[PDB]
Amino acid sequence: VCTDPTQLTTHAMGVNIYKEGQDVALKADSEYPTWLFQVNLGPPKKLEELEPESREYWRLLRKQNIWRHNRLSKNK
């Protein structure tokens, strides 16, 4: 398989590693839609990072609500 940093960063070696799928070259960054590279690359959205009016804010807060009960449940 690929063992070159230049080829690793300039050719899609990880997109397909099957036999039917041959390593495809990387198109230019502009050749893909902006949302492809605008996806969240940072750490998981915290309660501060999350918008109070975002669904993930409540869903992760709901997950946090489960955490506190679980911590209580573990001690029982």
Partner: protein, 142 residues
């Protein structure tokens, strides 16, 4: 009963992890591997694949499979076969933006794995979270 396994397609009879476990509920082991082998031919051999086999009381097989694991692929992409003891802070490989995104596009093709989300932010978190589970740091560029 839905049984989740990650057995590699290359080996259709791993033995203890599948053979007797499915047999304990009562099934034909040879039948399971043949249907699993059908998936093996379509898919690349030697790569772990999540399965959603349902063992019904009627002794029938309902084998459902999806795209190969990103977690092991990230281990392979990072050149890691056996990771660090903890992996919470131990890191042996770095994954850039582009490698992260090519695979995410491929992932958004299966019914299982909740891969029907319109935003791709759903895909990144699972692989980013998977990378955090592994001994890998997803750095922006190296």
């Amino acid at each position: 009963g839905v049984i989740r396994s990650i057995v590699r397609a290359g080996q259709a009879i791993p033995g203890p992890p599948l053979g007797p476990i499915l047999g304990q509920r009562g099934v034909s082991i040879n039948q399971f591997c043949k249907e699993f082998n059908e998936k093996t031919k379509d898919i690349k051999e030697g790569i772990p694949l999540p399965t959603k086999i349902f063992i019904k009381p009627d002794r029938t097989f309902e084998l459902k499979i999806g795209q190969p694991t990103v977690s092991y692929f990230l281990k392979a992409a990072a050149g890691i076969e056996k990771g660090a003891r903890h992996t919470g802070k131990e890191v042996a490989g770095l994954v850039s933006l582009k490698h992260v995104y090519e695979i995410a596009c491929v992932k958004a093709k299966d019914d299982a794995f909740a891969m029907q989300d319109v935003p791709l932010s759903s895909v990144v978190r699972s692989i980013i979270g998977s990378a955090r589970s592994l001994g890998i740091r997803v750095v922006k560029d190296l």
